Design a protein around this ligand. Sequence first.
Ligand SMILES: *C(=O)[C@@H](NC(=O)[C@H](C(=O)O)c1ccsc1)[C@@H]1N[C@@H](C(=O)O)C(C)(C)S1
Ligand SMILES: [Ca+2]
Length: 502
Amino acid sequence: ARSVRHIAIPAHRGLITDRNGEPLAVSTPVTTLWANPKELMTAKERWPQLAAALGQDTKLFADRIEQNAEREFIYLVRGLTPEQGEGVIALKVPGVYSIEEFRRFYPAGEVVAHAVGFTDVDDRGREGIELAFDEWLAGVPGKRQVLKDRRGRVIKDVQVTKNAKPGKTLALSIDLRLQYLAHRELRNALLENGAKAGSLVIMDVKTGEILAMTNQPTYNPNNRRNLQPAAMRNRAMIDVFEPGSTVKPFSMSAALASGRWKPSDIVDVYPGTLQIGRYTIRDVSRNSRQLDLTGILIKSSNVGISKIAFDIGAESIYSVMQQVGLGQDTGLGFPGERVGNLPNHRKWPKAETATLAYGYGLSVTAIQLAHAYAALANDGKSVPLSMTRVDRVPDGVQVISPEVASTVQGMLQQVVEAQGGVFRAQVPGYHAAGKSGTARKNAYRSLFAGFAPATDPRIAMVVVIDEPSKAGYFGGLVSAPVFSKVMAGALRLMNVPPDNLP
Ligand SMILES: *C(=O)[C@@H](NC(=O)[C@H](C(=O)O)c1ccsc1)[C@@H]1N[C@@H](C(=O)O)C(C)(C)S1
Ligand SMILES: [Ca+2]
């Protein structure tokens, strides 16, 4: 006859912005149309006009109502624009009611899809920052009393028992200007090399802020109809890999901290191979005998780093990679975020000791690698990672001694600047530093990791490109130029003064 019931007042989801207030995810009013079927069933002459307005076949529409005749609630359509919800309401069909809902719009679309993420049908986080800060963004549903007749018809609008609590604004650490650049250059690099995937992370070495995170492939999160799982993967945070030679700078920090090695020390890498039981450590270029520690990094000698590893022990190298966060929790609390793995031993056999030293048998992500490189560039101090704007920087942890970190920084500027090094990584007007890699996954993963300006580091960057299909596949040929192009732009967009001066 008369029953009081309660309907949910859905809340506004919080505005996401970039670090400078550029909107990245904006809650847009939509209209969900619902029908009371037992009510519809006394205005059957209206159904054809409604079916046609909802773009439905007349008999399919009528069978639907006639099927659910005993029900008092069916959805007609969720999430129409107001201008098409209202056009249906305008037919005045007895028992057709409307709900002002919210649906997300992403003004930057595919450029920042993986980082900002995606909302499900109920407007809840499903991916990236939407899933991570879902509780902060979500607000809380309101609650409204409704007097209902014995047919399921709304007798009245009684009195809201609770108010909708709207979710809060979130400013990302991401700089849309650097994100756009990182997106564009990584996309050009994929198509130019005919590669399958790629990731590029830009970090602030002083604050722990992620300034850009892009992956190929990506997707338009405004196109809800054809989600392909592959193109929605935030590769930077969920796709693990062996970092290969890009961990050699950590093996070297272990060596310089041991008390057993200085940069002017020599290793004999003749004849470019080294047998270790039934495994052969192999150098790409094999016309070397004596190399200085700096030369081992410039030539990327696997034998060279392996010999240093046999002398200092795997434990010292494991402990550096552990301290800088390789295969360790990032703390970022993105669900489904993979941590990869750092293998441990009580007794390190010779083979595992060598492969660790040149980055095999560990699995890391592009965000971990960028974070280790940020700790090296910021004088051996690791600042906690952040995907939201940092106004008050937390205390960092000293993970490599400042003198060792400074010495490895210099060796990495020679890797970029010296005869025979990775010249494609050179950032005109600046001193740049870092290290190439190329991992057998014949198909390859092309890596460059570094930071700039060398004289006072501000930015760390990782570029990873999976299976370039042109003739050049070395990280130094494929990823270095991307790091170069994006670094030139990123430093200039940050008004970092060019440091290649007298
Ligand atoms: C480090 O990544 C290391 N790569 C290799 O040794 C690869 C392997 O495991 O055999 C390799 C060798 C030729 S293609 C892949 C050295 N660093 C690389 C780099 O700096 O790009 C290298 C290709 C110079 S060898
Ligand atoms: Ca410094």
